Design a protein around this ligand. Structure first.
Ligand SMILES: [Mg+2]
Ligand SMILES: [Mg+2]
Ligand SMILES: [Mg+2]
Ligand SMILES: [Mg+2]
Ligand SMILES: [Mg+2]
Ligand SMILES: [Mg+2]
Ligand SMILES: [Mg+2]
Ligand SMILES: [Mg+2]
Ligand SMILES: [Mg+2]
Ligand SMILES: [Mg+2]
Ligand SMILES: [Mg+2]
Ligand SMILES: [Mg+2]
Ligand SMILES: [Mg+2]
Ligand SMILES: [Mg+2]
Ligand SMILES: [Mg+2]
Ligand SMILES: [Mg+2]
Ligand SMILES: [Mg+2]
Ligand SMILES: [Mg+2]
Ligand SMILES: [Mg+2]
Ligand SMILES: [Mg+2]
Ligand SMILES: [Mg+2]
Ligand SMILES: [Mg+2]
Ligand SMILES: [Mg+2]
Ligand SMILES: [Mg+2]
Ligand SMILES: [Mg+2]
Ligand SMILES: [Mg+2]
Ligand SMILES: [Mg+2]
Ligand SMILES: [Mg+2]
Ligand SMILES: [Mg+2]
Ligand SMILES: [Mg+2]
Ligand SMILES: [Mg+2]
Ligand SMILES: [Mg+2]
Ligand SMILES: [Mg+2]
Ligand SMILES: [Mg+2]
Ligand SMILES: [Mg+2]
Ligand SMILES: [Mg+2]
Ligand SMILES: [Mg+2]
Ligand SMILES: [Mg+2]
Ligand SMILES: [Mg+2]
Ligand SMILES: [Mg+2]
Ligand SMILES: [Mg+2]
Ligand SMILES: [Mg+2]
Ligand SMILES: [Mg+2]
Ligand SMILES: [Mg+2]
Ligand SMILES: [Mg+2]
Ligand SMILES: [Mg+2]
Ligand SMILES: [Mg+2]
Ligand SMILES: [Mg+2]
Ligand SMILES: [Mg+2]
Ligand SMILES: [Mg+2]
Ligand SMILES: [Mg+2]
Ligand SMILES: [Mg+2]
Ligand SMILES: [Mg+2]
Ligand SMILES: [Mg+2]
Ligand SMILES: [Mg+2]
Ligand SMILES: [Mg+2]
Ligand SMILES: [Mg+2]
Ligand SMILES: [Mg+2]
Ligand SMILES: [Mg+2]
Ligand SMILES: [Mg+2]
Ligand SMILES: [Mg+2]
Ligand SMILES: [Mg+2]
Ligand SMILES: [Mg+2]
Ligand SMILES: [Mg+2]
Ligand SMILES: [Mg+2]
Ligand SMILES: [Mg+2]
Ligand SMILES: [Mg+2]
Ligand SMILES: [Mg+2]
Ligand SMILES: [Mg+2]
Ligand SMILES: [Mg+2]
Ligand SMILES: [Mg+2]
Ligand SMILES: [Mg+2]
Ligand SMILES: [Mg+2]
Ligand SMILES: [Mg+2]
Ligand SMILES: [Mg+2]
Ligand SMILES: [Mg+2]
Ligand SMILES: [Mg+2]
Ligand SMILES: [Mg+2]
Ligand SMILES: [Mg+2]
Ligand SMILES: [Mg+2]
Ligand SMILES: [Mg+2]
Ligand SMILES: [Mg+2]
Ligand SMILES: [Mg+2]
Ligand SMILES: [Mg+2]
Ligand SMILES: [Mg+2]
Ligand SMILES: [Mg+2]
Ligand SMILES: [Mg+2]
Ligand SMILES: [Mg+2]
Ligand SMILES: [Mg+2]
Ligand SMILES: [Mg+2]
Ligand SMILES: [Mg+2]
Ligand SMILES: [Mg+2]
Ligand SMILES: [Mg+2]
Ligand SMILES: [Mg+2]
Ligand SMILES: [Mg+2]
Ligand SMILES: [Mg+2]
Ligand SMILES: [Mg+2]
Ligand SMILES: [Mg+2]
Ligand SMILES: [Mg+2]
Ligand SMILES: [Mg+2]
Ligand SMILES: [Mg+2]
Ligand SMILES: [Mg+2]
Ligand SMILES: [Mg+2]
Ligand SMILES: [Mg+2]
Ligand SMILES: [Mg+2]
Ligand SMILES: [Mg+2]
Ligand SMILES: [Mg+2]
Ligand SMILES: [Mg+2]
Ligand SMILES: [Mg+2]
Ligand SMILES: [Mg+2]
Ligand SMILES: [Mg+2]
Ligand SMILES: [Mg+2]
Ligand SMILES: [Mg+2]
Ligand SMILES: [Mg+2]
Ligand SMILES: [Mg+2]
Ligand SMILES: [Mg+2]
Ligand SMILES: [Mg+2]
Ligand SMILES: [Mg+2]
Ligand SMILES: [Mg+2]
Ligand SMILES: [Mg+2]
Ligand SMILES: [Mg+2]
Ligand SMILES: [Mg+2]
Ligand SMILES: [Mg+2]
Ligand SMILES: [Mg+2]
Ligand SMILES: [Mg+2]
Ligand SMILES: [Mg+2]
Ligand SMILES: [Mg+2]
Ligand SMILES: [Mg+2]
Ligand SMILES: [Mg+2]
Ligand SMILES: [Mg+2]
Ligand SMILES: [Mg+2]
Ligand SMILES: [Mg+2]
Ligand SMILES: [Mg+2]
Ligand SMILES: [Mg+2]
Ligand SMILES: [Mg+2]
Ligand SMILES: [Mg+2]
Ligand SMILES: [Mg+2]
Ligand SMILES: [Mg+2]
Ligand SMILES: [Mg+2]
Ligand SMILES: [Mg+2]
Ligand SMILES: [Mg+2]
Ligand SMILES: [Mg+2]
Ligand SMILES: [Mg+2]
Ligand SMILES: [Mg+2]
Ligand SMILES: [Mg+2]
Ligand SMILES: [Mg+2]
Ligand SMILES: [Mg+2]
Ligand SMILES: [Mg+2]
Ligand SMILES: [Mg+2]
Ligand SMILES: [Mg+2]
Ligand SMILES: [Mg+2]
Ligand SMILES: [Mg+2]
Ligand SMILES: [Mg+2]
Ligand SMILES: [Mg+2]
Ligand SMILES: [Mg+2]
Ligand SMILES: [Mg+2]
Ligand SMILES: [Mg+2]
Ligand SMILES: [Mg+2]
Ligand SMILES: [Mg+2]
Ligand SMILES: [Mg+2]
Ligand SMILES: [Mg+2]
Ligand SMILES: [Mg+2]
Ligand SMILES: [Mg+2]
Ligand SMILES: [Mg+2]
Ligand SMILES: [Mg+2]
Ligand SMILES: [Mg+2]
Ligand SMILES: [Mg+2]
Ligand SMILES: [Mg+2]
Ligand SMILES: [Mg+2]
Ligand SMILES: [Mg+2]
Ligand SMILES: [Mg+2]
Ligand SMILES: [Mg+2]
Ligand SMILES: [Mg+2]
Ligand SMILES: [Mg+2]
Ligand SMILES: [Mg+2]
Ligand SMILES: [Mg+2]
Ligand SMILES: [Mg+2]
Ligand SMILES: [Mg+2]
Ligand SMILES: [Mg+2]
Ligand SMILES: [Mg+2]
Ligand SMILES: [Mg+2]
Ligand SMILES: [Mg+2]
Ligand SMILES: [Mg+2]
Ligand SMILES: [Mg+2]
Ligand SMILES: [Mg+2]
Ligand SMILES: [Mg+2]
Ligand SMILES: [Mg+2]
Ligand SMILES: [Mg+2]
Ligand SMILES: [Mg+2]
Ligand SMILES: [Mg+2]
Ligand SMILES: [Mg+2]
Ligand SMILES: [Mg+2]
Ligand SMILES: [Mg+2]
Ligand SMILES: [Mg+2]
Ligand SMILES: [Mg+2]
Ligand SMILES: [Mg+2]
Ligand SMILES: [Mg+2]
Ligand SMILES: [Mg+2]
Ligand SMILES: [Mg+2]
Ligand SMILES: [Mg+2]
Ligand SMILES: [Mg+2]
Ligand SMILES: [Mg+2]
Ligand SMILES: [Mg+2]
Ligand SMILES: [Mg+2]
Ligand SMILES: [Mg+2]
Ligand SMILES: [Mg+2]
Ligand SMILES: [Mg+2]
Ligand SMILES: [Mg+2]
Ligand SMILES: [Mg+2]
Ligand SMILES: [Mg+2]
Ligand SMILES: [Mg+2]
Ligand SMILES: [Mg+2]
Ligand SMILES: [Mg+2]
Ligand SMILES: [Mg+2]
Ligand SMILES: [Mg+2]
Ligand SMILES: [Mg+2]
Ligand SMILES: [Mg+2]
Ligand SMILES: [Mg+2]
Ligand SMILES: [Mg+2]
Ligand SMILES: [Mg+2]
Lengths: 44, 97, 63, 76
RNA sequence: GGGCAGUUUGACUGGGGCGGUCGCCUCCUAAAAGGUAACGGAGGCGCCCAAAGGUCCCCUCAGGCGGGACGGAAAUCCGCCGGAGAGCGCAAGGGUAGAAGGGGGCCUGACUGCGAGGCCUGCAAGCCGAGCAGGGGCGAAAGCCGGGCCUAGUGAACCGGUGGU
RNA sequence: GUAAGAGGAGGUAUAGGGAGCGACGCUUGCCCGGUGCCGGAAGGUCAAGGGGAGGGGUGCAAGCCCCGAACCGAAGCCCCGG
RNA sequence: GGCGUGCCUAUUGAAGCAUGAGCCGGCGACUCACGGUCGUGGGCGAGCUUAAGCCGUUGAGGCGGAGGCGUAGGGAAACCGAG
RNA sequence: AGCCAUGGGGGAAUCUGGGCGGACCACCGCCUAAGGCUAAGUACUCCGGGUGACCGAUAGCGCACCAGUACCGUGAGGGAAA
RNA sequence: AACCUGGGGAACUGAAACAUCUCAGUACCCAGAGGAGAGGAAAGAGAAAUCGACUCCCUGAGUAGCGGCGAGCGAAAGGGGA
């Protein structure tokens, strides 16, 4: 299952790969956008 | 009969639209070095008949060259050449456009 | 009678000032999915070819 | 006849021998595991690739129970 | 809607067909650098993991023998022996306990912008990478972090979808 | 045959076209699930077209222009039989 | 007396029992146009050159700068510029 | 995907009218559809002339000559030599 | 004879297969015009508040652009001339 981490207070993205059924319903790991600097990211 | 090397890819986006080719002002670059060649009050008029502009229209003096003291009308100037040309003369910008 | 410039080339290769010929790195529009961040940054640049690079030029000339 | 098959042979081995001049970054050994270990001025990448950290000559060394090491004794 | 029309219906192959095979990784063939063929000998891959990742701290196997209530060849515990024959998600190989293996704390560098110098190489690709800047993680610190012990887990261009500038 | 028309036929189901079998004799069994053809005013699917909830572009504006849901739409296909 | 396996073609290999030719004469096959690329002989030179056409000739040349290439590159572009 | 043209359907206005400047709208401009005619510059070479770093009877037009003939073919057509 | 306008209009071939595309509006069939034919007095061009019927040459230009963005196709304004 493919995944792209959207940023909060924005709309950035990042290359990724969820895992769905295996314990993974909430993906919210950190990242770092070029716009601004350093922010938390959702799943989506 | 395999793939050419045409496996490469057109980054050259903005390549064409139906009516295509939007007419716009063509600026031609000309340095102070070939500008110092002569002297008086250089203008688009001189430069075309000089063999440097060739009706390419729109003139922008720029960069590499030793600023010969004199007046010089043009449609644009390089920040760099603008300062050199101020350090030994004066020059007005294009007409309307 | 009067060679036609190859548009496929013109549309995706630029011939440099010294003679070299450049174009974008391959594989970058959809191959990814999570491929290293290092990958896509280096796939972002453009490069020089060599022998086809000389084959390339022939396809232009008026250009 | 389920055979007749293989895989593109990776040209791996010692890429720079002892008593050779190397520039910083030069790959010294491409290896399967740690058939050679790093050492003075020689770091290795995620694949085990040993490479020079600075310019200089390359010198090998062995240490039995401790294994073999590649070095780069600089001087320039 | 073969009444009619234009076409397609692959290659390898001790002739062609039937059969089998077509890309990638491991080993042998391979003649002690690299590389090397055959419809030669053997196997695998088209995934998986938010912990199976980062860091800091700690621990060390398999097996054998002796002893223990359920247990019995084997569950759990004690003792002595045991240097790696275990483990390392999966094939083989190389590597490895002076950790890459097992357990825990905190964390998300499975970062952004780059990238000296090289391995491999017909092209295109593929691989390694110190270091600089930004903003961070773990550690007292020296430091380590641009996913996973590594080598498979993949697809030029073209055409279009989606989000942004 | 593009058509006008012509053949069928200046014939009319005891006639005409297509198909199979092939004097004559005794006969021609079972299977309709698939395929074909025949029947079926239901229903399901369906094109243009009708409709127009709602949405967008532009203009100060009256407007102009565009996108577009529900619902109503034939043969065919599905489905029910022979 | 010594020595001695036609010619061509095609081939790993031909005197070959592989191809072509009865013999002679004549006909018979890498061209031209335009556009490139390199070399070369010259003219000019940060410049070089005209095209159609016009005037002139009747195997005579000249005029014609519209235009083309070069003197600036980088960028998809807006733009900037020895960057 | 405008513009020009038009097979089918709906179907105006007469200058405060209409068409166009690449969907569409506003602004700014250009032009007057649904009637027709017009020389020159241009193309060709059956015919006449002139000229060739064009051929010289296997060349040159197929034909230097009583040749589109003889001869071949039902015919269209083929087609010499000299 | 060829040249010209119009009504119809192929395929081999190229894409190293082939179907879009190409060859090509070419071959050819037909109708018509004349020493020429066609075109022709802007419901034009398209960015200059610019040009001012048409035709033909040079150029712009292998540009703009078209294109299984493959093979390949390929303008116009403007400028120099008749
Ligand atoms: Mg999955
Ligand atoms: Mg998957
Ligand atoms: Mg995962
Ligand atoms: Mg991250
Ligand atoms: Mg950015
Ligand atoms: Mg292929
Ligand atoms: Mg334009
Ligand atoms: Mg501009
Ligand atoms: Mg420029
Ligand atoms: Mg400036
Ligand atoms: Mg030409
Ligand atoms: Mg092309
Ligand atoms: Mg792409
Ligand atoms: Mg895209
Ligand atoms: Mg995907
Ligand atoms: Mg990038
Ligand atoms: Mg096997
Ligand atoms: Mg093999
Ligand atoms: Mg092999
Ligand atoms: Mg090296
Ligand atoms: Mg590293
Ligand atoms: Mg690693
Ligand atoms: Mg030694
Ligand atoms: Mg030791
Ligand atoms: Mg059919
Ligand atoms: Mg046919
Ligand atoms: Mg077809
Ligand atoms: Mg096929
Ligand atoms: Mg075969
Ligand atoms: Mg066989
Ligand atoms: Mg054989
Ligand atoms: Mg064989
Ligand atoms: Mg045999
Ligand atoms: Mg068989
Ligand atoms: Mg059989
Ligand atoms: Mg077979
Ligand atoms: Mg491959
Ligand atoms: Mg291969
Ligand atoms: Mg071995
Ligand atoms: Mg082998
Ligand atoms: Mg080997
Ligand atoms: Mg040997
Ligand atoms: Mg092999
Ligand atoms: Mg699979
Ligand atoms: Mg698996
Ligand atoms: Mg593990
Ligand atoms: Mg681990
Ligand atoms: Mg007991
Ligand atoms: Mg009990
Ligand atoms: Mg019990
Ligand atoms: Mg042991
Ligand atoms: Mg082991
Ligand atoms: Mg374990
Ligand atoms: Mg084993
Ligand atoms: Mg092992
Ligand atoms: Mg060790
Ligand atoms: Mg450890
Ligand atoms: Mg662990
Ligand atoms: Mg651990
Ligand atoms: Mg833990
Ligand atoms: Mg941990
Ligand atoms: Mg716990
Ligand atoms: Mg440096
Ligand atoms: Mg390098
Ligand atoms: Mg590099
Ligand atoms: Mg190398
Ligand atoms: Mg390479
Ligand atoms: Mg090549
Ligand atoms: Mg490359
Ligand atoms: Mg690989
Ligand atoms: Mg990789
Ligand atoms: Mg680093
Ligand atoms: Mg820090
Ligand atoms: Mg300290
Ligand atoms: Mg690092
Ligand atoms: Mg890592
Ligand atoms: Mg792991
Ligand atoms: Mg780990
Ligand atoms: Mg692949
Ligand atoms: Mg695949
Ligand atoms: Mg793939
Ligand atoms: Mg692709
Ligand atoms: Mg394609
Ligand atoms: Mg796109
Ligand atoms: Mg988009
Ligand atoms: Mg009919
Ligand atoms: Mg009809
Ligand atoms: Mg009748
Ligand atoms: Mg009758
Ligand atoms: Mg009758
Ligand atoms: Mg009856
Ligand atoms: Mg009857
Ligand atoms: Mg009957
Ligand atoms: Mg009958
Ligand atoms: Mg009976
Ligand atoms: Mg019976
Ligand atoms: Mg029965
Ligand atoms: Mg039935
Ligand atoms: Mg039935
Ligand atoms: Mg039937
Ligand atoms: Mg019925
Ligand atoms: Mg029915
Ligand atoms: Mg119904
Ligand atoms: Mg519907
Ligand atoms: Mg419906
Ligand atoms: Mg509808
Ligand atoms: Mg509608
Ligand atoms: Mg509404
Ligand atoms: Mg809305
Ligand atoms: Mg509104
Ligand atoms: Mg309103
Ligand atoms: Mg309107
Ligand atoms: Mg309904
Ligand atoms: Mg109805
Ligand atoms: Mg209905
Ligand atoms: Mg129905
Ligand atoms: Mg059916
Ligand atoms: Mg159905
Ligand atoms: Mg003799
Ligand atoms: Mg003899
Ligand atoms: Mg042979
Ligand atoms: Mg023989
Ligand atoms: Mg003989
Ligand atoms: Mg024979
Ligand atoms: Mg033969
Ligand atoms: Mg012979
Ligand atoms: Mg021969
Ligand atoms: Mg003979
Ligand atoms: Mg013979
Ligand atoms: Mg004879
Ligand atoms: Mg002869
Ligand atoms: Mg002859
Ligand atoms: Mg000859
Ligand atoms: Mg030749
Ligand atoms: Mg020439
Ligand atoms: Mg030439
Ligand atoms: Mg020379
Ligand atoms: Mg000279
Ligand atoms: Mg010269
Ligand atoms: Mg001079
Ligand atoms: Mg010209
Ligand atoms: Mg005159
Ligand atoms: Mg005269
Ligand atoms: Mg004259
Ligand atoms: Mg004369
Ligand atoms: Mg005279
Ligand atoms: Mg004379
Ligand atoms: Mg002359
Ligand atoms: Mg004169
Ligand atoms: Mg001029
Ligand atoms: Mg000029
Ligand atoms: Mg001039
Ligand atoms: Mg003039
Ligand atoms: Mg040119
Ligand atoms: Mg130059
Ligand atoms: Mg550019
Ligand atoms: Mg700038
Ligand atoms: Mg400078
Ligand atoms: Mg419009
Ligand atoms: Mg109409
Ligand atoms: Mg009106
Ligand atoms: Mg008006
Ligand atoms: Mg009005
Ligand atoms: Mg109109
Ligand atoms: Mg209109
Ligand atoms: Mg207009
Ligand atoms: Mg529209
Ligand atoms: Mg107008
Ligand atoms: Mg009238
Ligand atoms: Mg006229
Ligand atoms: Mg006339
Ligand atoms: Mg003439
Ligand atoms: Mg004549
Ligand atoms: Mg004559
Ligand atoms: Mg004459
Ligand atoms: Mg003569
Ligand atoms: Mg004769
Ligand atoms: Mg004749
Ligand atoms: Mg003759
Ligand atoms: Mg005669
Ligand atoms: Mg004659
Ligand atoms: Mg007679
Ligand atoms: Mg005669
Ligand atoms: Mg003859
Ligand atoms: Mg006649
Ligand atoms: Mg016609
Ligand atoms: Mg065809
Ligand atoms: Mg062609
Ligand atoms: Mg073909
Ligand atoms: Mg072919
Ligand atoms: Mg074929
Ligand atoms: Mg076709
Ligand atoms: Mg056409
Ligand atoms: Mg035509
Ligand atoms: Mg047509
Ligand atoms: Mg057609
Ligand atoms: Mg008539
Ligand atoms: Mg006539
Ligand atoms: Mg007439
Ligand atoms: Mg007349
Ligand atoms: Mg006329
Ligand atoms: Mg005349
Ligand atoms: Mg007329
Ligand atoms: Mg005309
Ligand atoms: Mg007329
Ligand atoms: Mg404007
Ligand atoms: Mg202006
Ligand atoms: Mg004006
Ligand atoms: Mg004008
Ligand atoms: Mg007027
Ligand atoms: Mg004209
Ligand atoms: Mg002409
Ligand atoms: Mg002319
Ligand atoms: Mg494209
Ligand atoms: Mg193709
Ligand atoms: Mg065409
Ligand atoms: Mg003009
Ligand atoms: Mg003109
Ligand atoms: Mg003329
Ligand atoms: Mg004249």
């Amino acid at each position: 299952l493919l995944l792209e981490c959207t940023e909060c207070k924005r709309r950035n993205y990042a290359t990724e790969k969820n895992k769905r059924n295996t314990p993974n319903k909430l993906e919210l790991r950190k990242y770092c956008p070029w716009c601004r600097k350093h922010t938390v990211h959702r799943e989506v | 009969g395999r793939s050419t090397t045409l496996m490469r890819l057109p980054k050259r986006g903005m390549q064409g639209q139906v009516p295509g080719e939007i007419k716009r002002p063509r600026y031609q670059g000309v340095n102070l070095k070939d500008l110092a060649r002569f002297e008086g009050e250089v203008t688009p008029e001189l430069l075309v008949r000089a063999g440097l502009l060739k009706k390419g229209y729109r003139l922008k003096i720029l960069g590499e060259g030793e600023a010969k003291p004199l007046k010089v009308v043009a449609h644009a100037f390089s920040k760099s050449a603008l300062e050199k040309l101020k350090a030994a003369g004066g020059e007005p910008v294009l007409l309307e456009a | 009678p009067k060679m036609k410039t190859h548009k496929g080339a013109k549309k995706r290769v630029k011939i440099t000032a010294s003679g070299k010929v450049v174009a974008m790195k391959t594989g970058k529009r959809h191959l990814n999915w999570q491929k290293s961040g290092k990958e896509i940054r280096q796939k972002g640049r453009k490069f020089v070819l060599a022998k086809p690079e000389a084959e390339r030029i022939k396809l232009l000339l008026p250009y | 006849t389920k055979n007749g098959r293989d895989s593109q042979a990776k040209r791996l081995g010692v890429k720079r021998y002892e008593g050779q001049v190397v520039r910083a970054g030069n790959i010294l050994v491409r290896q399967r595991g740690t058939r050679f270990k790093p050492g003075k001025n020689v770091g290795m990448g995620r694949d085990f690739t040993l490479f020079a950290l600075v310019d200089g000559v390359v010198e090998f060394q062995d240490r039995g129970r401790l294994g073999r090491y590649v070095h780069v004794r600089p001087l320039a």
